[PDB]
Amino acid sequence: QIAVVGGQSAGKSSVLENFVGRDFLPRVTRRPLVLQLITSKAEYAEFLHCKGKKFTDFDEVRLEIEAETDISSIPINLRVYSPHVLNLTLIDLPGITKVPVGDQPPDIEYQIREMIMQFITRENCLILAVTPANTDLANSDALKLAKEVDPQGLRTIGVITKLDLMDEGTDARDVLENKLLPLRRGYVGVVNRSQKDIDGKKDIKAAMLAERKFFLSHPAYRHIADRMGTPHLQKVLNQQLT
Amino acid sequence: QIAVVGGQSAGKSSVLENFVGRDFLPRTRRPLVLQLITSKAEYAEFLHCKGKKFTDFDEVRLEIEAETDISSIPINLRVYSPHVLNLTLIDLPGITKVPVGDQPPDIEYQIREMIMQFITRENCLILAVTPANTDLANSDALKLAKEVDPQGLRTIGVITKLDLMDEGTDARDVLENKLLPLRRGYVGVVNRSQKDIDGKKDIKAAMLAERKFFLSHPAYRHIADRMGTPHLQKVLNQQ
Ligand SMILES: Nc1nc2c(ncn2[C@@H]2O[C@H](COP(=O)(O)OP(=O)(O)O)[C@@H](O)[C@H]2O)c(=O)[nH]1
Numbered sequence: 001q002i003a004v005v006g007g008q009s010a011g012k013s014s015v016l017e018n019f020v021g022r023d024f025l026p027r028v029t030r031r032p033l034v035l036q037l038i039t040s041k042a043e044y045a046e047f048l049h050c051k052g053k054k055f056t057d058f059d060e061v062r063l064e065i066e067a068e069t070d071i072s073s074i075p076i077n078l079r080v081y082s083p084h085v086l087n088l089t090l091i092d093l094p095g096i097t098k099v100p101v102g103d104q105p106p107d108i109e110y111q112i113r114e115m116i117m118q119f120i121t122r123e124n125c126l127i128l129a130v131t132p133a134n135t136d137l138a139n140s141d142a143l144k145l146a147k148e149v150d151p152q153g154l155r156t157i158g159v160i161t162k163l164d165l166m167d168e169g170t171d172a173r174d175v176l177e178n179k180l181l182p183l184r185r186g187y188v189g190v191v192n193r194s195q196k197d198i199d200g201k202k203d204i205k206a207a208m209l210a211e212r213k214f215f216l217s218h219p220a221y222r223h224i225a226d227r228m229g230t231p232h233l234q235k236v237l238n239q240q241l242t
Numbered sequence: 243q244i245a246v247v248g249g250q251s252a253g254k255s256s257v258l259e260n261f262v263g264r265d266f267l268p269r270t271r272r273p274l275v276l277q278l279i280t281s282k283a284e285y286a287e288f289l290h291c292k293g294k295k296f297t298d299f300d301e302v303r304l305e306i307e308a309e310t311d312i313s314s315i316p317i318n319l320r321v322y323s324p325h326v327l328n329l330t331l332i333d334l335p336g337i338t339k340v341p342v343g344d345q346p347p348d349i350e351y352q353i354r355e356m357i358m359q360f361i362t363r364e365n366c367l368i369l370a371v372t373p374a375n376t377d378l379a380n381s382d383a384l385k386l387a388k389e390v391d392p393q394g395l396r397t398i399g400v401i402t403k404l405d406l407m408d409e410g411t412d413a414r415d416v417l418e419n420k421l422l423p424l425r426r427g428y429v430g431v432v433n434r435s436q437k438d439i440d441g442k443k444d445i446k447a448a449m450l451a452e453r454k455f456f457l458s459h460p461a462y463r464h465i466a467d468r469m470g471t472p473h474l475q476k477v478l479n480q481q
């Protein structure tokens with residue numbers, strides 16, 4: 001199992017969608033989603049609670065995730081069979097917050113922390129510490145929770161998103177070179193679709209080429225471009241289980 | 243007094259430079275007590291250098307750097323200027339969550355305790371600083387401000403990096419006090435970027451770009467007279 005841990009809007013769901021090749025997640029996560037990816041000739045999806053029913057429409061998978069959510073600790077089990085995926089089990093976890101919004105409980109931070117802790121305390125669970133690049137890495141809730149249960153970094157891979165959203169005159173070179181805050185497995189830089197790209201109905205195919213172009217064109221990341229991007233992250237997660 | 247609270251790199255020190263009207267801070271370890279005094283003559287005074295009047299703000303930066311070397315004892319600085327209002331600012335170190343290099347393992351809680359020393363004081367106005375390119379529900383500043391001021395009686399929300407927001411996004415619901423309502427509402431600011439600091443861009447030029455940003459933004463246009471740092475200075479003055 002691979003748990004996606006980070007603050008709210010870190011880019012966790014976008015990472016999962018890139019691994020599928022189809023848009024199927026709602027845009028926020030209230031329950032943990034156990035997403036099993038299975039390499040198959042036939043492309044379809046099925047829910048644990050929705051036995052027998054196969055889904056060929058990924059918009060209907062999203063509506064079913066939305067229907068089942070309507071925070072809670074009981075997980076939603078989803079299996080996607082696809083020729084484009086690897087054999088990996090990922091857990092979409094709700095994002096860590098600090099202040100409750102609307103009719104949310106006041107201890108929501110400590111409930112989401114408790115929920116994540118049930119998954120990441122297990123020795124065979126690999127932690128994907130997702131942190132946006134346009135935030136200070138020392139302030140990462142993802143790294144703090146990962147160091148708590150895994151101090152040595154034996155099962156921690158740092159994920160740096162929103163690298164295209166960094167302020168002019170800055171880069172995350174020292175972070176991505178594993179220098180500012182070293183991890184045993186290091187960091188993998190990713191560039192997901194912006195809010196505009198999603199509303200503009202941009203493909204996951206067009207996202208990956210723009211992502212590869214970004215790392216090859218950036219002067220601060222060009223020298224490490226083959227250690228970057230979502231395909232390399234999928235490769236590293238596969239290389240451990242295989 | 244006014245305590246500037248946030249996570250690291252939130253844009254706290256930038257507020258102090260916009261209030262002063264001159265770039266003067268090195269690029270927080272120790273707290274900074276910046277007392278602003280409206281004066282005809284423009285100069286800066288340090289308590290430890292009792293007597294010396296500083297006229298070169300690049301020499302004020304060199305002294306802040308030299309005196310700093312985390313600790314709770316603050317560097318006390320007075321800035322006499324015709325463009326400032328009679329206010330005291332507490333530039334508190336930004337809270338982090340993971341120790342970097344030789345920093346103590348309990349650094350986060352060490353910073354929190356030091357911030358708590360100031361924000362537990364009843365006649366201390368809390369300036370909750372949150373960048374716009376981060377989710378407001380994740381605000382370290384707002385959590386800490388709500389821990390000592392649950393009613394929001396002495397909390398003013400400050401939103402930085404509105405120019406760094408993703409394409410197809412805005413903080414209108416935040417600045418309209420709808421997402422996370424605060425009694426005293428929110429003030430949006432546009433500070434010097436990292437290129438602007440490196441390129442030594444003037445504060446006057448940065449305050450002019452901040453003004454044109456709110457006047458131009460189709461999502462902040464209607465509230466432009468409630469936005470910007472000169473308005474934030476005016477709000478902290480009235481109180
Ligand atoms: N520009 C840019 N936007 C991103 C990136 N990753 C996520 N986003 C945007 O940030 C918001 C949050 O992304 P999401 O994956 O839903 O975050 P989650 O709550 O952690 O699952 C969405 O509006 C995304 O379009 C990125 O790498 N670059």
Ligand SMILES: Nc1nc2c(ncn2[C@@H]2O[C@H](COP(=O)(O)OP(=O)(O)O)[C@@H](O)[C@H]2O)c(=O)[nH]1
Nearest residue numbers: 251252253254255256402403432433434435436
């Ligand atoms: N583009 C942009 N950059 C900002 C803004 N506010 C702060 N920054 C940058 O963010 C970094 C941290 O700013 P700083 O004032 O030192 O934050 P502090 O550590 O909280 O005191 C600096 O490189 C600033 O240039 C803003 O509104 N817009």
